[PDB]
Design a protein around this nucleic acid. Structure first.
Lengths: 128, 136, 37, 272
RNA sequence: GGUCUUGUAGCUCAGUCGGUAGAGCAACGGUCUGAAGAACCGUGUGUCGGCAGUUCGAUUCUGCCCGAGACCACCA
RNA sequence: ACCUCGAUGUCGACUCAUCUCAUCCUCGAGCUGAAGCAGGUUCGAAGGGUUCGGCUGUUCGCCGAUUAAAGAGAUACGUGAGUUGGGUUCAAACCGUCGUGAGACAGGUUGGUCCCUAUCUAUUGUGCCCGUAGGAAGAUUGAAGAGUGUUGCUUCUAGUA
RNA sequence: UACUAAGUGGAAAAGGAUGUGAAAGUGCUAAAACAGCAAGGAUGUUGGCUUAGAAGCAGCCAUCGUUUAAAGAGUGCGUAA
């Protein structure tokens, strides 16, 4: 089993996903209409390796590992944590942590904020 | 490569490496060091090979010090000649080390890469090297 | 099965056996094994 | 022999009436006759018809498309040709600037303000430059991507003549080219390969090992697409390196991209 | 391999040789030329091969090195 | 510069070759950036064999054409009380060079005469005395042993994996 | 009384080693420590340069956090990631 994260504009791209045993048009249409509200953006998908493989695919909300750049109003995710790239208000960071609290091992907003700080460590900008 | 400035006499005694450490008998500037278990002579080429090995395995930083500087020089008697016309022709410089002499010290990027670099340095010389750590 | 004079473990498996009083270095791969190294 | 060239053209006339899909080119610079084929068996059977069916005996070599030349940072030298060959005196002298121009060919800019060069000599000197770049001191390909700026000169009496100024400008151009460390450019083709899954790593390793400019992946509807800007020399045997690894199930598109700087290895290989 | 000599302007050559670098040409400006060349008049260029020493300052004296040139390879 | 200057015959070629593996091919195996073919690599290891000519007096050198292959070291640059002497090294002469000239040049050229009647050890075949315990006549086994331990082609398998 | 496993003795080293034996120590554990085994060995997260993708892990640069008893931007192998 592998992890995948691709554009939400269309599920047609991806030959590895179509070769699992699921019809191309099937997941293409299904994903494109399940993201019809908001598409044309990067979304992380998850699927399993099943034998029948009719449809065992689901999506997840927008990844938050370098997504703080969206909150930081900048791009070009830094390789090294040597200098800071910008500032993010703590209110937005905590609101996003709560927004992703249910997803992960974090059980309170504080633990999700700790994980946000941990993934922001590499970026060079911390929870400020 | 590393030679003295001026030589009042170019022709000293042949050389003897016997004896124990007289000067630079210990490590006093690094954190790790290399000691020779036997008195030998280290010529310019082997010294430079060891130095470039240390430089290559040193990474970006790392502090290194040699306890001596190549001072002595050797002479080569002409080949295919009969016995007795004077002395030999001046040749490469060389440094003498005695039995039980600390020659080299390292710091900056600690003991793991220190020992790795010390092995890299010692794998270029005939001396049966011995790794030690300077104690503070 | 190489021949050297300084054995040092290159791969994960570089074990030794003094088999029939003769030292052979063996590895999970057929290349990293040695002899009288 | 040139007679062998003629008899091989006769063999070409015989062999083109059956299937003219093979292309033949007689290059004006590399000179050797390029003939296209499908694969090892195709070239082999062409040779068999040439030697047995046509009785034509011709040597076989390697494909020929070589290079382009240019030069490094600018400089300014002078050209003084005081010479004569045929019955009277001749003289000429100019002063030009030898400057590279990365994205533009031959360009002329005049700096004659004190009347050092009459306008009549403005144009011929340009031609003297345009013919001087044709030779290079490394392997002899024409020098391109150069901006020329004429600065000064001297028109004397009847000893002066336009072709003398052209020759002096040629001397200046060659001398400055020798000074300014000339460099070479190799042809680079843009090759696009579309494979479902099988030869992803195979092509990756072939390009990385042989040569080429690559960047990652393109993921087409149900296939993998890779575009590489690769030297045209690297196509030698690549047609069968890919095909043999693909069991004959490989395809690509060959389109010329541009001339790119030759690395030091290429500098060592081609020179005699 | 030494045994010697030489290394001086952009070429060829001298030096109170322990107290100064100068000649013909190369080389620019002018004279002049119905065409130029040629010719003439004035330049100018200078670690005296590189190092060390002695003293007094080494282009010269001593030693070393480098490049090149002249002589020979026991037993003949 | 240590025995041999009251003498250690040295070039090449021929023949006799033998021995060593630190192995060139044939043998076996392992690894392989070794699909096979086609290769390299490392080990065991001397059982064997490892060509014919041109130039050169002439090894060393090249080439030509071959075998499956066209290895090296040691035997006084193996091998003259085994063969020759084209060769440096006689007397002779000549070219060039040098030296006042006489004369000399790992410069060249023309050539220029190699003595051996064998005592023993050795060694190869062939014998005599007698031995091994009655004499004579046979059959014998076999102890250390001696001698060969080389290889290619075609075809089928199979155009098969 | 200790040692030998090499006939070392009965020639040599650069080198390397869970070889043997002894000594000086340093920790845990009979509740059953360690080896092996039945398993798990996870998420933000496919962090970014980039290999016509950076994705755990060609490499390079950072080189953290949450639950857990456990999980390291991972320990490595290995894959086109």
């Amino acid at each position: 089993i592998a992890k995948i994260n691709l554009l939400g504009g269309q599920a047609k791209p991806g030959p590895a996903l179509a070769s699992v045993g699921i019809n191309m048009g099937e997941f293409t249409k299904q994903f494109n209409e399940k993201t019809k509200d908001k598409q044309g953006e990067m979304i992380p998908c998850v699927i399993t390796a099943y034998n029948d493989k009719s449809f065992d695919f689901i999506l997840k909300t927008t990844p938050v590992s370098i997504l703080l750049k969206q909150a930081a109003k900048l791009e070009k995710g830094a390789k090294n944590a040597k200098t800071i790239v910008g500032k993010i208000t703590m209110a937005k960071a905590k609101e996003i942590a709560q927004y992703k609290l249910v997803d992960l091992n974090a059980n309170t907003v504080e633990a999700a904020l700790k994980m946000v700080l941990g993934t922001a460590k590499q970026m060079g900008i911390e929870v400020i | 490569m590393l030679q003295p400035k001026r030589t009042k006499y170019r022709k000293p005694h042949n050389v003897s490496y016997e004896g124990k450490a007289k000067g630079n008998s210990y490590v006093a500037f690094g954190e790790y060091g290399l000691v020779a278990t036997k008195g030998n002579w280290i010529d310019a080429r082997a010294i430079e090979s060891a130095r470039i090995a240390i430089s290559k395995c040193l990474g970006k930083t790392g502090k290194m010090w040699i306890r001596i500087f190549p001072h002595m020089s050797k002479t080569k008697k002409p080949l295919e000649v009969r016995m007795g016309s004077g002395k030999g022709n001046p040749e490469f410089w060389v440094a003498v080390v005695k039995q039980g002499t600390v020659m080299f010290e390292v710091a900056n990027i600690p003991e793991s890469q220190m020992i790795k670099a010390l092995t890299r340095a010692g794998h270029k010389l005939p001396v049966t090297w011995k790794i030690l750590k300077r104690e503070e | 099965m190489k021949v050297r004079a300084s054995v040092k473990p290159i791969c994960k498996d570089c074990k030794i056996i003094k088999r029939h009083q003769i030292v052979r270095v063996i590895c999970k791969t057929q290349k990293h094994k040695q002899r009288q190294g | 022999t040139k007679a062998d060239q003629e008899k091989m053209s006769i063999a070409l006339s015989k062999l083109a009436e059956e299937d003219p899909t093979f292309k033949t080119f007689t290059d004006p610079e590399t000179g050797q006759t390029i003939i296209a084929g499908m694969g090892e068996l195709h070239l082999d059977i062409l040779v068999d018809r040439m030697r047995r069916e046509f009785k034509v005996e011709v040597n076989v070599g390697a494909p020929q498309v070589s290079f382009r030349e240019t030069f490094n940072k600018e400089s300014e030298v002078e050209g003084k040709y005081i010479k004569q060959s045929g019955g009277r005196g001749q003289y000429g002298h100019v002063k030009i600037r030898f400057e590279p121009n990365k994205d533009k060919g031959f360009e002329f800019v005049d700096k004659i303000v004190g009347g050092r060069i009459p306008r009549e000599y403005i144009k011929p000197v340009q031609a003297g430059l345009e013919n001087a770049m044709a030779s290079g001191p490394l392997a002899g390909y024409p020098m391109i991507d150069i901006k020329a700026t004429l600065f000064d000169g001297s028109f004397h009496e009847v000893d002066s003549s336009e072709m003398a100024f052209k020759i002096a400008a040629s001397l200046a151009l060659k001398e400055a080219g020798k000074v300014c460390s000339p460099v070479l450019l190799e042809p680079i083709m843009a090759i696009e390969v579309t494979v479902p899954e099988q030869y992803f790593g195979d092509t990756m390793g072939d390009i990385s090992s042989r040569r080429g400019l690559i960047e990652g992946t393109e993921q087409r509807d149900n296939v993998q697409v890779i575009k590489a800007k690769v030297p045209l020399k690297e196509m030698f045997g690549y047609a069968t390196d890919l095909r043999s690894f693909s069991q004959g199930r490989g395809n690509y598109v060959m389109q010329f991209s541009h001339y790119a700087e030759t690395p030091k290895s290429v500098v060592n290989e081609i020179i005699a």
